[PDB]
Amino acid sequence: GHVETIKNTFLNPKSNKVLVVAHRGNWRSAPENSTAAIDSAIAMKVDIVEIDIQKTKDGQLILMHDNTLDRTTTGKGEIKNWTLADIKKLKLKDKDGKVTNYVVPTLEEALLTAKGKIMVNLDKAYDIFDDVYAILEKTETQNQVIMKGGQPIETVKREFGSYLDKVLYMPVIDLGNKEAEKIITDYLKELRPAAFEIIYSDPKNPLPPKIKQLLFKKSLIWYNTLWGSLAGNHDDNLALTDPEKSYGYLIEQLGARILQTDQPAYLLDYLRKKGWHN
């Protein structure tokens, strides 16, 4: 359905539109990393949901950011020490810490909720690419998923090269690293990805303008506004004061065409007023 429409922007490196990524789903409306948070993102016409993956003792893949259950659920302990069935007996806490009737979803459940409707970016999935791919195949969602990681293209080809013509892969590069430019140019040459996720903490890092020129009309640039260290203090809190100084700067000065935010309703509203999103 709508996901095909979203993908035609994601696959257009000349796009004048800016895609919205809801970090962990729209957690402002339902618990993070839940199917309810995905359905909220879909209802709001978010383009991509980012979801975090962990593996249970019994080898099942669930949505969970932390290595432990403590912050977001009624249980405690390391995910790797719990079985899926026992995790399913717990309940998710909402953003205010109130216990809900929602449960931890499996990756399969999340993908089935997203299927046909919203693209999905998985985090913490690179090292288990093959286990994830089997679930993508089971749910027939490989054409709407964006895998990502930080390894150079030589390593990704060696480890999971046979998957690169089957699912989208987006490199993540921290511009505070001395090898950042080479990692990017090697990806551009060898993989020609649809997008690159760019991270930098220092507002005066010299590379963001260079990356705009390197990736101009070649790949979409994804920046994160979740907190200060991800995009030189151009974050969601700054955007509440002045969205032009935060989101506008990233889009217009740095060439961002995808933004991952913790306030997707607010970002969508801004983008719609700018004529940069439907």
Short mmCIF file of C-alpha atoms in Angstrom, two decimals:
data_model
loop_
_atom_site.label_atom_id
_atom_site.label_comp_id
_atom_site.label_asym_id
_atom_site.label_seq_id
_atom_site.Cartn_x
_atom_site.Cartn_y
_atom_site.Cartn_z
CA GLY A 1 0.00 0.00 0.00
CA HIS A 2 1.38 3.36 1.13
CA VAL A 3 4.83 1.83 1.73
CA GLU A 4 5.45 1.60 -2.04
CA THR A 5 4.76 5.31 -2.33
CA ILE A 6 7.17 6.06 0.54
CA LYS A 7 9.84 3.90 -1.08
CA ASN A 8 9.66 5.83 -4.33
CA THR A 9 10.86 8.90 -2.39
CA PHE A 10 13.49 6.84 -0.46
CA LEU A 11 14.86 5.60 -3.83
CA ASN A 12 15.00 9.10 -5.31
CA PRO A 13 18.31 10.75 -4.44
CA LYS A 14 17.08 13.96 -6.10
CA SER A 15 14.13 14.17 -3.70
CA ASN A 16 13.03 17.67 -2.60
CA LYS A 17 10.87 16.06 0.11
CA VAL A 18 12.04 15.16 3.62
CA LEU A 19 11.13 11.77 5.08
CA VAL A 20 10.30 11.38 8.79
CA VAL A 21 11.64 8.55 10.91
CA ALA A 22 9.88 7.90 14.23
CA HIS A 23 12.58 6.70 16.64
CA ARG A 24 11.25 3.57 18.37
CA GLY A 25 7.86 4.25 16.84
CA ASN A 26 5.67 7.17 17.98
CA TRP A 27 6.46 6.61 21.67
CA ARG A 28 4.83 9.89 22.57
CA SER A 29 1.51 8.01 22.03
CA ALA A 30 2.28 4.43 23.14
CA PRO A 31 5.24 2.55 24.65
CA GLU A 32 8.48 2.69 22.70
CA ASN A 33 9.27 -0.36 20.53
CA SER A 34 5.67 -1.60 20.61
CA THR A 35 3.23 -2.47 17.87
CA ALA A 36 0.98 0.31 19.25
CA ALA A 37 3.78 2.84 18.68
CA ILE A 38 4.14 1.56 15.11
CA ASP A 39 0.41 1.83 14.50
CA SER A 40 0.53 5.40 15.86
CA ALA A 41 3.31 6.26 13.43
CA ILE A 42 1.28 4.78 10.58
CA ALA A 43 -1.84 6.72 11.58
CA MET A 44 0.20 9.95 11.54
CA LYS A 45 1.71 9.18 8.08
CA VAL A 46 5.24 8.80 9.30
CA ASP A 47 7.51 7.41 6.53
CA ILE A 48 9.83 5.12 8.44
CA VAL A 49 9.81 3.60 11.90
CA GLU A 50 13.06 2.77 13.57
CA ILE A 51 12.89 -0.20 15.98
CA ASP A 52 15.54 -1.78 18.16
CA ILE A 53 16.15 -5.55 18.29
CA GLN A 54 17.33 -7.91 21.08
CA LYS A 55 17.61 -11.70 21.21
CA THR A 56 16.09 -13.83 23.96
CA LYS A 57 17.70 -16.83 25.70
CA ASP A 58 15.72 -19.09 23.33
CA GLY A 59 16.95 -17.21 20.26
CA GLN A 60 13.83 -15.23 19.44
CA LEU A 61 14.09 -11.68 18.14
CA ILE A 62 12.07 -9.06 19.99
CA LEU A 63 11.78 -5.30 19.94
CA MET A 64 13.77 -3.88 22.85
CA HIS A 65 16.36 -1.11 23.01
CA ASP A 66 18.22 -1.95 26.20
CA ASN A 67 20.07 -5.21 27.03
CA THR A 68 17.79 -5.37 30.06
CA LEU A 69 14.05 -5.39 30.71
CA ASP A 70 14.16 -2.93 33.56
CA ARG A 71 13.50 0.48 31.99
CA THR A 72 10.52 -0.33 29.73
CA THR A 73 8.82 -3.34 31.25
CA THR A 74 7.46 -4.71 34.50
CA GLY A 75 10.36 -7.22 34.60
CA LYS A 76 14.04 -6.99 35.36
CA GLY A 77 17.19 -8.63 34.02
CA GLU A 78 19.10 -9.26 30.86
CA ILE A 79 17.07 -10.17 27.76
CA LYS A 80 19.56 -12.98 27.02
CA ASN A 81 18.60 -14.67 30.31
CA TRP A 82 14.86 -14.68 29.59
CA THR A 83 12.73 -16.79 27.28
CA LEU A 84 10.22 -15.18 24.93
CA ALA A 85 7.28 -16.82 26.67
CA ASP A 86 8.27 -15.41 30.03
CA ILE A 87 8.94 -11.94 28.54
CA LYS A 88 5.39 -12.07 27.09
CA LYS A 89 3.98 -12.33 30.61
CA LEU A 90 5.40 -8.87 31.40
CA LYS A 91 3.78 -5.56 30.44
CA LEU A 92 5.19 -2.45 28.79
CA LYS A 93 5.42 0.89 30.58
CA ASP A 94 4.37 4.06 28.75
CA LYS A 95 6.47 7.25 28.49
CA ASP A 96 5.13 8.43 31.86
CA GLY A 97 6.12 5.09 33.49
CA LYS A 98 2.55 3.81 33.83
CA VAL A 99 2.03 0.10 33.32
CA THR A 100 -0.08 -0.63 30.20
CA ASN A 101 -1.74 -3.75 28.84
CA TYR A 102 0.68 -3.86 25.94
CA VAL A 103 3.29 -6.58 25.65
CA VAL A 104 6.75 -6.86 24.13
CA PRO A 105 6.35 -7.76 20.43
CA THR A 106 8.53 -10.10 18.41
CA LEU A 107 10.26 -8.71 15.36
CA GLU A 108 7.83 -10.77 13.27
CA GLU A 109 4.86 -9.08 14.98
CA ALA A 110 6.34 -5.63 14.39
CA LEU A 111 6.98 -6.37 10.70
CA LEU A 112 3.43 -7.70 10.23
CA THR A 113 2.08 -4.48 11.78
CA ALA A 114 4.22 -2.41 9.39
CA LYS A 115 3.66 -4.54 6.30
CA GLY A 116 2.46 -2.54 3.33
CA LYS A 117 2.19 0.69 5.35
CA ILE A 118 5.47 2.08 6.63
CA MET A 119 9.16 1.42 6.02
CA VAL A 120 11.10 -0.14 8.87
CA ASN A 121 14.68 0.60 9.91
CA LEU A 122 16.17 -1.94 12.26
CA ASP A 123 18.87 -1.06 14.73
CA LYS A 124 21.10 -3.47 16.64
CA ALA A 125 20.43 -6.04 13.85
CA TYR A 126 23.65 -6.03 11.84
CA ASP A 127 25.45 -8.81 13.74
CA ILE A 128 22.34 -11.04 13.33
CA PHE A 129 21.60 -10.02 9.69
CA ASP A 130 20.91 -13.63 8.62
CA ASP A 131 18.53 -14.36 11.55
CA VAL A 132 16.75 -11.09 10.76
CA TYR A 133 16.60 -11.89 7.03
CA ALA A 134 14.82 -15.22 7.74
CA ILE A 135 12.06 -13.21 9.53
CA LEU A 136 11.95 -10.66 6.68
CA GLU A 137 11.41 -13.61 4.27
CA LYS A 138 8.77 -15.22 6.56
CA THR A 139 6.75 -11.95 6.68
CA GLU A 140 7.64 -11.00 3.01
CA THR A 141 8.81 -7.57 4.17
CA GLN A 142 12.36 -7.57 2.80
CA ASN A 143 11.35 -4.90 0.25
CA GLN A 144 10.37 -2.36 2.98
CA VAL A 145 13.17 -2.81 5.48
CA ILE A 146 16.37 -0.74 5.86
CA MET A 147 19.23 -2.59 7.55
CA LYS A 148 22.10 -0.48 8.91
CA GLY A 149 25.39 -0.65 10.69
CA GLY A 150 28.79 1.00 11.08
CA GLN A 151 31.21 -1.44 9.48
CA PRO A 152 33.10 -0.63 6.28
CA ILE A 153 31.82 -2.04 3.02
CA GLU A 154 34.65 -4.67 2.93
CA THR A 155 33.40 -6.17 6.24
CA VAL A 156 29.70 -6.06 5.28
CA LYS A 157 30.42 -7.75 1.92
CA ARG A 158 32.46 -10.45 3.66
CA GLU A 159 29.90 -11.11 6.40
CA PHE A 160 26.59 -10.65 4.57
CA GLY A 161 27.35 -9.80 0.94
CA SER A 162 24.78 -12.23 -0.48
CA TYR A 163 22.02 -10.22 1.24
CA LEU A 164 22.93 -6.83 -0.28
CA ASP A 165 20.90 -7.25 -3.47
CA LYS A 166 17.96 -8.54 -1.36
CA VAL A 167 17.46 -5.81 1.27
CA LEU A 168 18.32 -2.15 1.54
CA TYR A 169 21.43 -1.34 3.58
CA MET A 170 22.26 2.11 4.92
CA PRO A 171 25.71 2.81 6.33
CA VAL A 172 25.99 4.77 9.60
CA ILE A 173 29.03 7.03 9.80
CA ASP A 174 30.28 9.11 12.70
CA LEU A 175 32.12 12.15 11.29
CA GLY A 176 34.13 12.40 14.47
CA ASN A 177 36.07 9.36 13.19
CA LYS A 178 39.18 10.07 11.12
CA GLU A 179 38.26 7.43 8.45
CA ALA A 180 34.72 8.81 7.94
CA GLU A 181 35.24 10.21 4.45
CA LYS A 182 36.88 7.03 3.10
CA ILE A 183 34.15 4.83 4.63
CA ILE A 184 31.57 7.01 2.82
CA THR A 185 33.32 7.16 -0.54
CA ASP A 186 33.98 3.39 -0.50
CA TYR A 187 30.22 2.81 0.14
CA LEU A 188 29.29 5.26 -2.61
CA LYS A 189 31.54 3.46 -5.08
CA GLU A 190 30.87 -0.15 -4.09
CA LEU A 191 27.28 -0.24 -2.88
CA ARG A 192 25.63 3.02 -4.09
CA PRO A 193 23.27 3.01 -1.11
CA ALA A 194 19.93 4.80 -1.21
CA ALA A 195 20.85 6.66 1.97
CA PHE A 196 23.58 7.32 4.50
CA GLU A 197 23.01 8.00 8.20
CA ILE A 198 25.45 10.76 9.28
CA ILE A 199 26.27 11.42 12.93
CA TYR A 200 28.47 14.16 14.36
CA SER A 201 28.75 15.73 17.82
CA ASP A 202 30.88 18.83 17.36
CA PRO A 203 28.87 21.71 15.86
CA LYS A 204 32.08 22.83 14.08
CA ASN A 205 33.04 19.43 12.71
CA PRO A 206 34.49 20.28 9.29
CA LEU A 207 32.93 17.37 7.41
CA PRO A 208 29.13 17.93 7.16
CA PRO A 209 29.46 20.48 4.29
CA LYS A 210 31.85 18.13 2.49
CA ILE A 211 29.47 15.21 2.92
CA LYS A 212 26.65 17.35 1.43
CA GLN A 213 28.80 17.91 -1.64
CA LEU A 214 29.89 14.22 -1.83
CA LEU A 215 26.34 12.86 -1.57
CA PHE A 216 24.53 15.60 -3.60
CA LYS A 217 21.97 14.00 -5.84
CA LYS A 218 23.64 10.63 -5.27
CA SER A 219 22.18 9.35 -1.98
CA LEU A 220 19.81 10.65 0.64
CA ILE A 221 21.33 12.11 3.80
CA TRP A 222 19.80 11.02 7.09
CA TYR A 223 20.43 13.07 10.27
CA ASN A 224 19.15 12.40 13.77
CA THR A 225 17.67 15.09 16.05
CA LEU A 226 17.23 12.88 19.11
CA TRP A 227 19.87 14.53 21.30
CA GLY A 228 22.77 16.96 21.00
CA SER A 229 25.65 14.59 20.21
CA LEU A 230 24.05 13.27 17.05
CA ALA A 231 23.94 16.34 14.84
CA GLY A 232 25.98 19.12 16.35
CA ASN A 233 23.32 20.18 18.84
CA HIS A 234 20.66 20.55 16.11
CA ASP A 235 18.12 18.54 18.06
CA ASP A 236 14.47 18.25 18.90
CA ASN A 237 14.73 20.60 21.89
CA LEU A 238 16.32 23.32 19.81
CA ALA A 239 13.56 22.73 17.23
CA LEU A 240 10.87 23.40 19.87
CA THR A 241 12.37 26.93 20.28
CA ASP A 242 13.10 27.48 16.61
CA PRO A 243 12.60 24.74 14.11
CA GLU A 244 14.41 26.69 11.40
CA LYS A 245 17.60 26.72 13.51
CA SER A 246 17.50 22.95 14.01
CA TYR A 247 15.51 21.11 11.30
CA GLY A 248 15.88 23.93 8.75
CA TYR A 249 19.63 24.04 9.22
CA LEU A 250 20.03 20.28 8.73
CA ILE A 251 17.79 20.24 5.65
CA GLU A 252 18.84 23.38 3.88
CA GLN A 253 22.49 23.86 4.95
CA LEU A 254 23.51 20.20 5.35
CA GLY A 255 21.23 18.65 2.72
CA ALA A 256 19.25 16.33 4.96
CA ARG A 257 16.40 14.54 3.21
CA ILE A 258 15.58 12.15 6.08
CA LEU A 259 15.31 13.13 9.75
CA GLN A 260 14.96 10.72 12.68
CA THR A 261 13.13 12.41 15.57
CA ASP A 262 11.62 11.79 18.97
CA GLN A 263 8.74 14.22 18.12
CA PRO A 264 7.38 13.02 14.79
CA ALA A 265 4.04 14.93 14.99
CA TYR A 266 5.94 18.16 15.54
CA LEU A 267 8.47 17.52 12.77
CA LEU A 268 5.68 16.49 10.33
CA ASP A 269 3.81 19.69 11.15
CA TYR A 270 6.92 21.77 10.47
CA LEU A 271 7.66 19.95 7.21
CA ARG A 272 4.07 20.34 6.02
CA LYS A 273 4.18 24.10 6.71
CA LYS A 274 7.47 24.25 4.69
CA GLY A 275 5.98 22.31 1.76
CA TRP A 276 8.59 19.55 2.29
CA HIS A 277 6.12 16.75 3.22
CA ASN A 278 2.55 15.88 2.29
#
